[PDB]
Amino acid sequence: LACQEITVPLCKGIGYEYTYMPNQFNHDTQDEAGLEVHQFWPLVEIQCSPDLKFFLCSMYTPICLEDYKKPLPPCRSVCERAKAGCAPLMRQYGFAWPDRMRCDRLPEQGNPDTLCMDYERTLEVLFQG
């Protein structure tokens, strides 16, 4: 579970530099993760949410920190903003918000027992409850 430089094009320049495999989807390589995340590219191009790119990468190329050796998922707020912007459009064309992307299964900000990832304005990563 060593850190490796992110090489998925969608996730290059996302605000953190390294990821790790396997991810929560059981993808063994970034090549495998990159292939599946490619499916979302029309929404990325349409730009239904400024949060979609960050959210997808936090799942497919989860952040890897040299001084923190546990999964650091995105905050529920990140999922909720991406779903707000893009899920109505996805539903219009027969796509449900993916089950593996259910927002209530992600840790809340300010939760004492977990750490989760968000960002603010250039993109600076913020760690939160």
From Swiss-Prot:
Domain named FZ: residues: 1-119
Post-translational modification comment from the UniProt entry: Ubiquitinated by ZNRF3, leading to its degradation by the proteasome.
Chain positions recorded as hexadecanoate binding sites: Q39, F40, W41, P42, L43, V44, E45, I46
Region (Wnt-binding): 63-68, 115-119
Localization terms from the record: Membrane; Golgi apparatus; Cell membrane
Residues with attached carbohydrate: E17
Disulphide-bonded residues: C3-C64, C11-C57, C48-C86, C75-C116, C79-C103
Tissue: Expressed in chondrocytes.
Protein family (similarity comment): Belongs to the G-protein coupled receptor Fz/Smo family.
Description of how the protein assembles with itself and partners: Component of a Wnt-signaling complex that contains a WNT protein, a FZD protein and LRP5 or LRP6. Interacts directly with LRP5 or LRP6; the interaction is promoted by Wnt-binding and signaling and inhibited by DKK1. Interacts (via the PDZ-binding motif) with GPOC (via its PDZ domain). Interacts with RSPO1 and RSPO3. Interacts with glypican GPC3.
Function field: Receptor for Wnt proteins. Component of the Wnt-Fzd-LRP5-LRP6 complex that triggers beta-catenin signaling through inducing aggregation of receptor-ligand complexes into ribosome-sized signalosomes. The beta-catenin canonical signaling pathway leads to the activation of disheveled proteins, inhibition of GSK-3 kinase, nuclear accumulation of beta-catenin and activation of Wnt target genes.
Record remark on domains: Lys-Thr-X-X-X-Trp motif interacts with the PDZ domain of Dvl (Disheveled) family members and is involved in the activation of the Wnt/beta-catenin signaling pathway.
Protein name per the record: Frizzled-8
Natural source organism: Mus musculus
